[PDB]
Design a protein around this ligand. Sequence first.
Ligand SMILES: *[C@@H]1O[C@H](CO)[C@@H](O)[C@H](O)[C@H]1NC(C)=O
Ligand SMILES: *[C@@H]1O[C@H](CO)[C@@H](O)[C@H](O)[C@H]1NC(C)=O
Ligand SMILES: *[C@@H]1O[C@H](CO)[C@@H](O)[C@H](O)[C@H]1NC(C)=O
Ligand SMILES: *[C@@H]1O[C@H](CO)[C@@H](O)[C@H](O)[C@H]1NC(C)=O
Ligand SMILES: *[C@@H]1O[C@H](CO)[C@@H](O)[C@H](O)[C@H]1NC(C)=O
Ligand SMILES: *[C@@H]1O[C@H](CO)[C@@H](O)[C@H](O)[C@H]1NC(C)=O
Ligand SMILES: *[C@@H]1O[C@H](CO)[C@@H](O)[C@H](O)[C@H]1NC(C)=O
Ligand SMILES: *[C@@H]1O[C@H](CO)[C@@H](O)[C@H](O)[C@H]1NC(C)=O
Ligand SMILES: *[C@@H]1O[C@H](CO)[C@@H](O)[C@H](O)[C@H]1NC(C)=O
Ligand SMILES: *[C@@H]1O[C@H](CO)[C@@H](O)[C@H](O)[C@H]1NC(C)=O
Ligand SMILES: *[C@@H]1O[C@H](CO)[C@@H](O)[C@H](O)[C@H]1NC(C)=O
Ligand SMILES: *[C@@H]1O[C@H](CO)[C@@H](O)[C@H](O)[C@H]1NC(C)=O
Ligand SMILES: *[C@@H]1O[C@H](CO)[C@@H](O)[C@H](O)[C@H]1NC(C)=O
Ligand SMILES: *[C@@H]1O[C@H](CO)[C@@H](O)[C@H](O)[C@H]1NC(C)=O
Ligand SMILES: *[C@@H]1O[C@H](CO)[C@@H](O)[C@H](O)[C@H]1NC(C)=O
Lengths: 467, 469
Amino acid sequence: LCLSQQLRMKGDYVLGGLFPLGEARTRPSSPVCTRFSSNGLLWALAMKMAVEEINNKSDLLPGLRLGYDLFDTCSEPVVAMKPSLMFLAKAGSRDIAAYCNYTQYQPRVLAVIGPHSSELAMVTGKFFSFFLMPQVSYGASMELLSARETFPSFFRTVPSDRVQLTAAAELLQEFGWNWVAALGSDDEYGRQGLSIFSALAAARGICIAHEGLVPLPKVQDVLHQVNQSSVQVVLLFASVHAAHALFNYSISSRLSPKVWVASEAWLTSDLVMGLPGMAQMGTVLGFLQRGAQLHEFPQYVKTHLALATDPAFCSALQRCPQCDCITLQNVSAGLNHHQTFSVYAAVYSVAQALHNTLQCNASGCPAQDPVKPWQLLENMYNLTFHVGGLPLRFDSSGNVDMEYDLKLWVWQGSVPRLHDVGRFNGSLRTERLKIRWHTSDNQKPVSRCSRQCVRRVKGFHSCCYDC
Amino acid sequence: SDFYLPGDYLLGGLFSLHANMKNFLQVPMCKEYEVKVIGYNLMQAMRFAVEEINNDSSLLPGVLLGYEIVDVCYISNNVQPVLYFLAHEDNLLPIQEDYSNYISRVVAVIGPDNSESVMTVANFLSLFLLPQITYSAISDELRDKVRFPALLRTTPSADHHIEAMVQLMLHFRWNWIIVLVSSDTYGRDNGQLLGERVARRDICIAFQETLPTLQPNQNMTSEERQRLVTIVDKLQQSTARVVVVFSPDLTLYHFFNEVLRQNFTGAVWIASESWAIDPVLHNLTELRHLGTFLGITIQSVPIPGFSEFREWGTCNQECDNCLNATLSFNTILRLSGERVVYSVYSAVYAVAHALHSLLGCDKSTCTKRVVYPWQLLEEIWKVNFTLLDHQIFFDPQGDVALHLEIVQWQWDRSQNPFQSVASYYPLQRQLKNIQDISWHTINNTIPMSMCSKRCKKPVGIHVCCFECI
Ligand SMILES: *[C@@H]1O[C@H](CO)[C@@H](O)[C@H](O)[C@H]1NC(C)=O
Ligand SMILES: *[C@@H]1O[C@H](CO)[C@@H](O)[C@H](O)[C@H]1NC(C)=O
Ligand SMILES: *[C@@H]1O[C@H](CO)[C@@H](O)[C@H](O)[C@H]1NC(C)=O
Ligand SMILES: *[C@@H]1O[C@H](CO)[C@@H](O)[C@H](O)[C@H]1NC(C)=O
Ligand SMILES: *[C@@H]1O[C@H](CO)[C@@H](O)[C@H](O)[C@H]1NC(C)=O
Ligand SMILES: *[C@@H]1O[C@H](CO)[C@@H](O)[C@H](O)[C@H]1NC(C)=O
Ligand SMILES: *[C@@H]1O[C@H](CO)[C@@H](O)[C@H](O)[C@H]1NC(C)=O
Ligand SMILES: *[C@@H]1O[C@H](CO)[C@@H](O)[C@H](O)[C@H]1NC(C)=O
Ligand SMILES: *[C@@H]1O[C@H](CO)[C@@H](O)[C@H](O)[C@H]1NC(C)=O
Ligand SMILES: *[C@@H]1O[C@H](CO)[C@@H](O)[C@H](O)[C@H]1NC(C)=O
Ligand SMILES: *[C@@H]1O[C@H](CO)[C@@H](O)[C@H](O)[C@H]1NC(C)=O
Ligand SMILES: *[C@@H]1O[C@H](CO)[C@@H](O)[C@H](O)[C@H]1NC(C)=O
Ligand SMILES: *[C@@H]1O[C@H](CO)[C@@H](O)[C@H](O)[C@H]1NC(C)=O
Ligand SMILES: *[C@@H]1O[C@H](CO)[C@@H](O)[C@H](O)[C@H]1NC(C)=O
Ligand SMILES: *[C@@H]1O[C@H](CO)[C@@H](O)[C@H](O)[C@H]1NC(C)=O
């Protein structure tokens, strides 16, 4: 199939890449992942399509070829740490020097398309910070990666968790639910979400009645503590598995209906919607990403998979040994994936930053010495790049700005359907006259505490009073 | 200089010699930051351990143990050091699929004193399996060996600190406490761990609040002033008189100034490992009116001749203000004993013992063979020896069972500033040998921190609170 031979392409300014191509020691040997992951290969194909189309363009990067060096990274950081060392080694050499600062380095890759995993993105960004290598990541949406103190050269094309948590806090404030309960997964994702939402609520007036963590597949104690306070709105910032476990337990325990606020992790997961008896657990109100999609990605991937089988093209022309023995039906399921657009836009943003740095114009590019990776950072912050006709911008803190849609689970024949009732764009606007609530009638559930009054201070943060 | 000693086998070191006391193109070197005396004391401890090892003809005989100490910043600079350690003598680090035959500049690195820097360094070093024993790092994430194969430790994890805190609370019968955490990951993790541990031991937390990130010696905006006064007002309003603080010693200056200004008195402050043995914070002497101060530390082990050694004495590897800054701290540091100094001492001696066993010498010349870091890491798990009447051996999860100690702050410049009042034994998870504690009450009555007097219907979420019927 000669698919892995396309993972490297020569060019004037080659690009980096860290993708979850594969999945899974008393000696210092790099682990080898043999299992195949469809999402990683699809994202790699998406970035390859982006680079090929950009090279096809004449207005962007005229007269210059853009290369790429894709690399297989498992979920582990040990496997992905080596490719970064290869990235920052001098061109034509396999040795990386230990210099005093970044100015003495000559990396062989202009930029790096960072890993999808959040913890792996953390490790890679902390490593790339020393050399000031501009790394843009897809799907790494943790908030602590926005701290410019420790990640001076980390960008992203997906909104951070802070945006959706701010949207949730604004939803709680607008609807008057100033006495809520906050929960999250025991992993890093839930803990960080809880830490952000505590500060957001404390700033916005809302305060947490009980702040707990639901362990991954205890939970009995967590929902008991949630019961112990008369709170009708619970914010569940948990992954798919922890949220599914909590919902299954509450279905087995017959817990009273409540207004659950859903993170993007389990708002769209079919694992939780398909859980029997879920319809008897109140409304689910979450914020979902409002992003575009690569219209021509499925056509590109199908024609490229068909073309790769032809021996003539392969003869005319390893990182992923299991990427060769593959059929189209092994990647057809995840063809309509959102992260492909994120990867495509990240590649386009890096190319636009390179085009601006060289001060190129429509006809061509001025002659100069090769641009070091750290020179990209000046033109990469506060940069407006167009991706498929929709403008995008990098914040001063290195995050893209995009809108959100407030969706609620509307039940009809035990088949939950997501319905648009609001839109978050930094200032939440909702249409509450259409929301169908779970109470006996169509009345908004009430979950408010009295901050003024005999007064007995109550709450996890000593905020409210029991008059 | 004192950052480099030539030897047959080098010994990397990562010490926080400076702290952020207050454009990404230029990198701020750690030299211009203010001098941290504790980091310099730990560096002196490691140097003294190496010199003592070289003195003895019974440990590593005929082989000179050298070291290459470099200055790691709290968070700022922690990549370059490890790159310098892993490179060859020509400052070149080759990249290969296998590292079994690869020999690095250093054979083992005494890890940093910060959990996050230890995590980053261990993630970098997992490729080469470079042995690394960290001191004063308490993050629970470092106990598992799946993601940190080459990481060890010389202090108990946060579980033992939280257990000692809960045992101290149970001994004096406090079931109504307030927990204050910092905005950084260490404070949040420690607070969550304490909450989980204490929810099942019939002790209820009144409330939990986060102190804003606040480096001292800087101008603070009105927003954080408002946050601080709100936190202190909530502290004073609540009936709980036992406050447990999980925050780095840098943040607490503004908070303590604010509570002193608010004139709130009569609370038992329990300190985490971070600021329990802070001399630069204990020197305030204006906190004596805030009540009694306790803390969770490592037992003081009197190292003979360390104080005399301390008094007699590339880039990011030199500091100038350290000696003058620590000169004013000589008396209090000498009186306070050695708590983490012993941790660094034991880590260096454990590396030396592992190297001695691996080289296979017995009170004579060694085999002077080539040593790969993974071999040293493999041989370092089985070290077992008596050191200052203490046993040093590693648990299967890379922890050393060094007894903890609850310490109490007393302000007497002629005596020990941190007086031990309780001893905690990690192996049996029991706190015993509690001595007399000087309380802030009238006749030394133990402080009462309970949300309801002993009588029964419950009121509020917490079980500890009720009303007598
Ligand atoms: C680039 O353009 C050529 C024709 O000029 C076309 O055949 C090819 O598919 C294009 N590549 C893309 C769209 O990736
Ligand atoms: C749901 O909870 C029940 C009750 O504990 C348990 O037996 C069952 O395995 C759970 N179901 C799933 C699908 O995990
Ligand atoms: C949870 O709350 C309801 C309403 O307060 C209570 O009746 C019920 O017993 C509690 N437990 C469960 C398992 O539903
Ligand atoms: C391709 O799909 C087939 C059928 O589903 C499966 O057995 C095979 O393992 C897949 N190939 C891989 C994962 O490389
Ligand atoms: C664009 O760059 C080319 C290449 O150096 C240069 O010759 C030309 O003058 C520039 N401007 C225009 C308008 O083409
Ligand atoms: C940089 O940001 C400023 C202020 O937000 C904006 O006015 C300006 O257009 C930006 N510069 C660009 C996009 O080159
Ligand atoms: C956000 O949407 C509101 C309407 O809900 C609109 O008035 C406002 O201008 C929008 N802001 C931006 C930055 O697009
Ligand atoms: C980088 O280190 C070199 C060492 O020779 C020094 O001359 C240069 O000024 C440094 N550059 C910085 C700190 O930006
Ligand atoms: C022993 O170590 C001390 C410092 O601890 C040093 O001054 C001395 O030279 C060493 N050797 C002897 C023989 O005392
Ligand atoms: C701000 O900093 C200056 C300079 O250190 C100091 O004089 C002043 O008191 C500080 N505070 C305010 C409120 O200006
Ligand atoms: C206590 O502190 C307050 C607040 O600054 C101050 O006004 C007062 O004089 C102090 N002393 C007493 C006895 O209240
Ligand atoms: C400790 O506080 C005293 C009294 O204010 C002060 O003079 C001294 O500089 C401080 N620091 C020391 C002794 O290191
Ligand atoms: C330390 O202070 C002394 C005066 O006590 C001074 O002469 C000396 O230069 C200082 N050393 C430094 C700043 O390294
Ligand atoms: C270390 O040796 C001592 C003394 O022989 C013994 O009591 C102890 O159990 C040993 N520890 C281990 C882990 O073998
Ligand atoms: C303290 O104890 C002494 C000695 O028994 C006694 O005289 C005094 O009344 C006690 N004070 C209080 C306040 O209980």
